[PDB]
Write a protein that binds this DNA or RNA. Structure first.
Ligand SMILES: [Mg+2]
Ligand SMILES: [Mg+2]
Ligand SMILES: [Mg+2]
Ligand SMILES: [Mg+2]
Ligand SMILES: [Mg+2]
Ligand SMILES: [Mg+2]
Ligand SMILES: [Mg+2]
Ligand SMILES: [Mg+2]
Ligand SMILES: [Mg+2]
Ligand SMILES: [Mg+2]
Ligand SMILES: [Mg+2]
Ligand SMILES: [Mg+2]
Ligand SMILES: [Mg+2]
Ligand SMILES: [Mg+2]
Ligand SMILES: [Mg+2]
Ligand SMILES: [Mg+2]
Ligand SMILES: [Mg+2]
Ligand SMILES: [Mg+2]
Ligand SMILES: [Mg+2]
Ligand SMILES: [Mg+2]
Ligand SMILES: [Mg+2]
Lengths: 76, 136, 117, 177, 51
RNA sequence: CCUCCUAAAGAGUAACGGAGGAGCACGAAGGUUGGCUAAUCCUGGUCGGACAUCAGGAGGUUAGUGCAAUGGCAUAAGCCAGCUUGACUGCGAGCGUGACGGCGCGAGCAGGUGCGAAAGCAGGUCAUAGUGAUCCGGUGGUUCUGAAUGGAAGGGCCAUC
RNA sequence: ACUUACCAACCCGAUGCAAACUGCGAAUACCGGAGAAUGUUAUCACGGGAGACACACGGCGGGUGCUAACGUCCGUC
RNA sequence: UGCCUGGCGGCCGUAGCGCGGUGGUCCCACCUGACCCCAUGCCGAACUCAGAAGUGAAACGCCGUAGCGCCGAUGGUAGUGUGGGGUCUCCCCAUGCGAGAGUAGGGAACUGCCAGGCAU
């Protein structure tokens, strides 16, 4: 039947890019699935939000046999 | 009259018809009818041209149609204001960029293929050129 | 899945969690004929201590190399060698095998000998 | 136990000399015997499946597994998870004790028996056959059987070809055509 | 919708209660679960009652 | 209210633009420990067929996910079993997203709990819809208040309708 | 069961098409760090006072319409 | 020090698949037995325990081999930021950036810790 509907934009995406200094707890990426996976010092929330578990620099990296994206936190 | 048998979606955004063609070589027959222009070919134009060249070769040889009208075209009727939803699909076009080989032929002498293509070209809204098969 | 691949799959989750926690792990390997034990540093690329039934010094005082008694011997051996190098706190990695029989005998022996897990 | 001994002492000997294998481990072995009862009509009468299970349990001395519908199909009017049959996987002593009972007393009691087919091989050595009456098995009582049922018998072997698979069964003097 | 609100009351005597929903048709039996009672500061058995 | 495209490779972005879905469900369909791995095609097989159940081979997640879409998912988030109630109470470094009201994510601390030998995991469900401010009133609790005083009514505070 | 000037999915080779396809993938733009020069602090916070929430055309990228409109609706200058 | 094997990693197809060959003293595997520990919505298949009669058949490791996967220039082409221009639905010029596909070619991995067998 008729169209006309759409939902509110969920403001997902990368909140802190590579090199950015973050304090423990800071959301690095809001995503729907695990487009990025949690690496060293990075936690994964119930809505697959990746967050900092320790103060430091955001590091993006491709690891493993499945060539997956990982967000980690390097000490600064 | 050519048309997709089924489609994922009924209607499609207008879009643009920028760039040069893909499929610029006689890949199946000995001769071709290449587009030099940019435009849309309707399913009726494609058929009209196909009929002309077929009658010309007295249904000897083999014909290939390298284009397919997979683009749905909508239209608002008379006495209808703007808005109130996208119009209804009326016909199907194939976007044509300069270089597209439209039709291909083999099994006929060059002179005949040239005439058949001259006759089909007159049914088309865009400028064409006769092309021959090449070694690479 | 074939026996080996099926076992590695069974072992992957725990090993990734141990990697994440940065824990020193006591890795056990079992075979119909032999039982092995290695204490691997959190990096996973270097062995701190090891003991097995392929070792002439251990196999000599055992009836059969692939039984619960041999497993308890390998267990006592790693813990003793680990404690001589100051390694006290570890995490047991059953490596896809059930925590039972031979694997259990090795872990209960290491716990007895003084290893903390 | 009798036919496993017969395999070891006389069948291996026969096959090795027939195909000229470099190793004894190349010799086709009888891997497993799978008995299956496709009830199908259990959807109307649930009790019918239970009798098919109790029948299979008498034939092979082990509790049958009641197989459920893998996917729903409109053709037979069945929904996913419906008990639509029962199977038994036979291995070791029970496989051999059954294999002897099949050749020695069950298969000879088939109505107007002349010999089972030798062309019903899956193309990779494994043999598939089907019984029409379950009363051929002396473990089943004619006076107590509610209905006349049949079952599928599949002999899974380590044979690489049908030629090899044929020779493994023929060596057990399996009643062929 | 066809699911009703129910209260789980503390057996510890304290007025404390948890609140949940229940499909009264499919599951007619009274719901029993061990839950933490913040008044006695211990895990006690809780039993279903009307909301 | 939710999902995709339009949306111009951060976020956001309009139209009576193009397509769909929600206004629930689940005491297990939740937690944990242990295990398991689809679709589809070919060959063989009682009744039995294009398709039911059984066996082998190819295949390699195209399956599955309570439901729309998209992103995820094998270490499975998919499927099964044992034990269970973490579908805990108080809090919360630090963040995201909003004009605001709000909404969301969160390691960690305290008390108490379940599962596991243990490392550990659990503050519901793969995630994102499943909703209703305030007022007024109802029910239970309460070191609060109690118009001379002691009570009480009524009010507050906590829970909830 | 046998067979046919018909139709024919899958698979292989060849050829195209896609806003709601992607085993590829820019230019730009955007986020963060450091450094100089320049710029009447241009920046942030708090406080006093507003106006404004009918926009228009032109360029580029689009939706809609007929790649019609001095049309209509977004983005960006 | 060399060869061989097992375990745990790095790396994540130049590393994989296929085809051919090859290995059992040791290791690994299949294997033998199963009352029991423990196990099967049935089954000692798997999980598991007690072993050593057999075999490297399968698997696994190693060696070889460009049928496939995979990696992949140079040059040209497509696009595009800025400035300019035309016949302005689309293009062109100056400048900077510069794909994707295809072509030549590469390619039968490389590497660390520990342990065991053998040899000098
Ligand atoms: Mg965007
Ligand atoms: Mg953008
Ligand atoms: Mg679930
Ligand atoms: Mg698990
Ligand atoms: Mg069939
Ligand atoms: Mg415990
Ligand atoms: Mg008074
Ligand atoms: Mg008073
Ligand atoms: Mg201000
Ligand atoms: Mg207004
Ligand atoms: Mg306005
Ligand atoms: Mg405007
Ligand atoms: Mg205007
Ligand atoms: Mg075995
Ligand atoms: Mg071999
Ligand atoms: Mg370059
Ligand atoms: Mg590139
Ligand atoms: Mg390239
Ligand atoms: Mg390529
Ligand atoms: Mg070469
Ligand atoms: Mg050595």
């Amino acid at each position: 039947t008729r169209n006309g509907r759409d939902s509110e934009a969920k403001r997902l995406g990368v909140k802190r890019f590579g090199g950015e200094s973050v304090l423990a707890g800071s959301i690095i990426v809001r995503q729907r699935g695990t487009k990025f996976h949690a690496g060293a010092n990075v936690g994964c929330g119930r809505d697959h939000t990746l967050f900092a578990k320790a103060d430091g620099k955001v590091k993006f990296e491709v690891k493993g046999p499945k060539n997956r994206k990982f967000i980690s936190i390097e000490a600064e | 009259m050519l048309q997709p048998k089924r489609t994922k979606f009924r209607k499609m955004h207008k879009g643009r018809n920028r760039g040069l063609a893909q499929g610029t070589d006689v890949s199946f027959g000995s001769f071709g009818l290449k587009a030099v222009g940019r435009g849309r070919l309707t399913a009726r134009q494609i058929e009209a041209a196909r009929r002309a060249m077929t009658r010309a070769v007295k249904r000897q040889g083999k014909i290939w149609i390298r284009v397919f009208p997979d683009k749905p075209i909508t239209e608002k009727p008379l006495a209808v204001r703007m808005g109130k939803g996208k119009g209804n699909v009326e016909y199907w076009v194939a976007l044509i960029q300069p270089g597209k080989v439209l039709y291909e032929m083999d099994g006929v002498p060059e002179e005949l293929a040239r005439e058949a293509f001259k006759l089909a070209a007159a049914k088309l809204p865009i400028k064409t050129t006769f092309v021959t098969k090449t070694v690479m | 899945m074939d026996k080996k691949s099926a076992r590695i799959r069974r072992a992957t989750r725990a090993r990734r969690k141990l990697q994440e926690l940065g824990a020193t792990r006591l890795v056990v390997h079992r075979t119909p004929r032999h039982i092995y034990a290695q204490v691997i540093a959190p990096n996973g690329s270097e062995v701190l201590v090891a003991a097995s039934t392929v070792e002439k010094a251990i196999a000599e005082q055992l009836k059969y190399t692939g039984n619960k008694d041999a497993a308890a011997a390998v267990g006592k051996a790693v813990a003793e060698r680990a404690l001589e190098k100051g390694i006290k706190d570890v995490s047991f990695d059953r490596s896809g095998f059930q925590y039972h029989g031979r694997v259990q005998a090795l872990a209960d022996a290491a716990r007895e000998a003084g290893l903390q897990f | 136990a009798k036919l496993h001994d017969y395999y070891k002492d006389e069948v291996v000997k026969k096959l090795m000399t027939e195909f000229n294998y470099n190793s004894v481990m190349q010799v086709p072995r009888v891997e497993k015997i799978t008995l299956n009862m496709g009830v199908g009509e259990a959807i109307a009468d649930k009790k019918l499946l239970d009798n098919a299970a109790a029948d299979l349990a008498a034939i092979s001395g082990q509790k049958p597994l009641i197989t459920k519908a893998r996917k729903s199909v409109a053709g037979f009017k069945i929904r996913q998870g419906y008990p639509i049959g029962c199977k038994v996987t036979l291995r070791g002593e029970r496989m051999w004790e059954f294999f002897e009972r099949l050749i020695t007393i069950a298969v000879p009691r088939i109505r107007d028996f002349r010999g089972l087919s030798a062309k019903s091989f899956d193309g990779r050595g494994n043999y598939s056959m089907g019984v029409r009456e379950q009363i051929i098995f002396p473990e089943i009582d004619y006076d107590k059987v509610d209905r006349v049922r049949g079952l599928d018998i599949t002999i899974t072997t380590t044979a690489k070809s049908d030629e090899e698979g044929r020779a493994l069964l023929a060596a057990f003097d399996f009643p062929f055509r | 919708g066809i699911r009703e609100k129910i209260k789980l009351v503390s057996s510890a005597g304290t007025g404390h209660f948890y609140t949940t929903t229940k499909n009264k048709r499919t599951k007619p039996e009274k719901l029993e679960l061990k839950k933490f009672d913040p008044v006695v500061r211990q895990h006690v058995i809780y039993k279903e009652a009307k909301i």
